[PDB]
């Protein structure tokens, strides 16, 4: 658009093509997202959701969304760190920061609903920020909470804690926890790991729209097997983020007080930009 000069195509997304652009009025570099009234209302409310761990929506040019620009996303970083693995102190700092952003948005009744590594942006200062926050409501299974896969219509902020659980496990193991090709394959990958849910562990699950009594019954695996060699604090946190039951699932604000974060620090990553 006339205020901007597109500098380079960054890539793509569920919403459209993403470009690095330069504001000609001010020389600021931004991310410009070309999208494919209640939507623009909703998208616009997102302008007021400012937190240091949420990528800032600067304006909405009715659609192009102009966002604050960051050089790298967590998927690129993990891919680069795949041989060696991200050091624990950094995983912990990132998790802590993402929990802060979530707790903020969740306090304002705003959910992401589509968290994935390509949506988590990182800088050289050690920050990590949530991109595309809110855009789903305003208008890749791998990070989807089981309530959504089972057809719940009124899912909650819990869904983002699940997604972040899955990411936390991926940073630690250097492998996606639940890499599904179908909703059913997504769900079976989950069940094969945490076991097939039932009323014991998830009260009301059997009433979910897509629940089937004929689901194969798998036994739960130990978390020490799922995220070796994460320590006890980390595993304990992770198990609470990955509870089937959305009401048992730890809140972002609760997670921040977990003892895994007792010695959280803010390391700086090794970025090649
Ligand atoms: N602000 C953003 O949403 C973008 C950003 O600043 N930088 C960035 O690399 N991306 C991006 C991330 C992953 C794939 C394609 C583009 C953003 O979406």
Shape: globular
Integer-rounded radius of gyration: 19 Å
What's the structural domain tally? 2
Cα distance, first to last residue?
26 Å
Structural class computed from helices and strand pairing: alpha+beta
The name of the CATH topology of the largest domain is: Transferase(Phosphotransferase), domain 1
* Count of helix runs: 10
Binding site for ATP: 10-18, 33, 68-70, 73, 116-119, 132
Domain Protein kinase: 4-261
Cofactor: Mg(2+)
Binding site for Mg(2+): 119, 132
Secondary structure layout:
Elements: E1 4-11, E2 18-23, E3 29-34, H1 38-45, E4 57-61, E5 64-68, E6 72-73, H2 74-80, H3 88-107, E7 120-122, E8 128-130, H4 135-138, H5 146-149, H6 158-173, H7 183-194, H8 223-226, H9 232-241, H10 252-256
Antiparallel strand pairs: 1-2, 2-3, 3-5, 4-5, 6-7, 7-8
Helix pairs in contact: 3-6
This protein binds 2,4,6-trioxo-1-phenyl-hexahydropyrimidine-5-carboxamide (RJI).
Site (CDK7 binding): 9, 75-76, 141
Binding site for ATP: 10-18, 33, 68-70, 73, 116-119, 132
Modified residues (Phosphothreonine): 14
